[PDB]
Amino acid sequence: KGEELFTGVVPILVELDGDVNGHKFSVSGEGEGDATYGKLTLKFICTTGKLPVPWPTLVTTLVQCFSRYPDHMKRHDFFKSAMPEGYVQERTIFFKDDGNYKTRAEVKFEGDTLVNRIELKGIDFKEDGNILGHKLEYNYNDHQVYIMADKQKNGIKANFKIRHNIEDGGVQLADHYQQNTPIGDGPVLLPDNHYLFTTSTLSKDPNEKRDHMVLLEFVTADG
């Protein structure tokens, strides 16, 4: 069972290759996750220079298998059971009155490391808008995610809004549409619909000279 792979502390690697309006960049993340409590600690670096979008806009893209699933719902855990073979995660994210991200990721085990490997393509952004103009506050407003059985494939889907506070006032909406499918061909758990609740905290490493994001997350699933 894939759930057995999460009983202790699991190292995490995140690799993102991005291209937003032709501005190409890479992000790496490293840390660990504890699905017993639902805690994630990760540090991300823009390894190509200055990040061409704001860090908060990448949080959802940069591993819901680490959610704390309570006892009575363990057999509704699609994300962990897909392991070690893993799952594909696809999203489209529409930024209101601005461009959009299209992301494809594979989440799987490589050795004992849970790896999230992402391709991101952004198009139709305004160069002086809130994203390419870096006009968003360095913080986060988390939102619940209603995970529904992709009753029609075998997998899951969800859609939800994320709100990014704008420095000069107001809020930038990021409308998320998500589909996940197992990579393997073994049997999938196909959960009953349920919520994921997340609390994310962004900070900085005072000793890090590169463009970076320190991220601490707590995540649980609810009936």
Swiss-Prot record:
Effect of N100T: In EBFP1.2; shifts the excitation and emission spectra to shorter wavelengths and increases quantum yields compared to BFP
Result after altering Q64H: In P4; leads to no detectable fluorescence. In mut2.2; shifts fluorescence lifetime from 3.03 to 1.94 ns. In mut3.3; shifts fluorescence lifetime from 3.03 to 1.88 ns
Function field: Energy-transfer acceptor. Its role is to transduce the blue chemiluminescence of the protein aequorin into green fluorescent light by energy transfer. Fluoresces in vivo upon receiving energy from the Ca(2+)-activated photoprotein aequorin.
Biological processes, Gene Ontology terms: bioluminescence; generation of precursor metabolites and energy
Family note: Belongs to the GFP family.
The organism's place on the tree of life at top rank: Eukaryota
Modification note: Contains a chromophore consisting of modified amino acid residues. Maturation of the chromophore requires nothing other than molecular oxygen.
Outcome recorded upon mutating V171A: In mut2.1; shifts fluorescence lifetime from 3.03 to 2.50 ns
Source organism phylogeny: Eukaryota, Metazoa, Cnidaria, Hydrozoa, Hydroidolina
Gene for this chain: GFP
Consequence of substituting N141I: In ECFP; leads to cyan fluorescence, folds faster and more efficiently at 37 degrees Celsius and has superior solubility and brightness
Phenotype when changing V188A: In mut1.5; shifts fluorescence lifetime from 3.03 to 2.72 ns
UniProt-recorded name of the protein: Green fluorescent protein
Effect after changing Y140H: In mut1.3; shifts fluorescence lifetime from 3.03 to 2.78 ns. In mut1.5; shifts fluorescence lifetime from 3.03 to 2.72 ns. In mut1.27; shifts fluorescence lifetime from 3.03 to 2.85 ns
Ranges in a coiled coil: none
Expression tissues: Photocytes.
Documented effect of changing D150V: In EBFP2.0; shifts the excitation and emission spectra to shorter wavelengths and increases quantum yields compared to BFP
Effect of V63L: In EYFP; leads to yellow fluorescence, folds faster and more efficiently at 37 degrees Celsius and has superior solubility and brightness
Result of changing T198I: Suppresses the 475 nm excitation peak, leaving only the shorter wavelength peak at 399 nm. In H9; increases fluorescence at 395 nm excitation
Subunit text: Monomer.
Biotechnological exploitation: Green fluorescent protein has been engineered to produce a vast number of variously colored mutants, fusion proteins, and biosensors. Further generation of mutants led to more stable proteins (at 37 degrees Celsius for example) with brighter fluorescence and longer fluorescence lifetimes.
Matches recorded under Pfam families: GFP
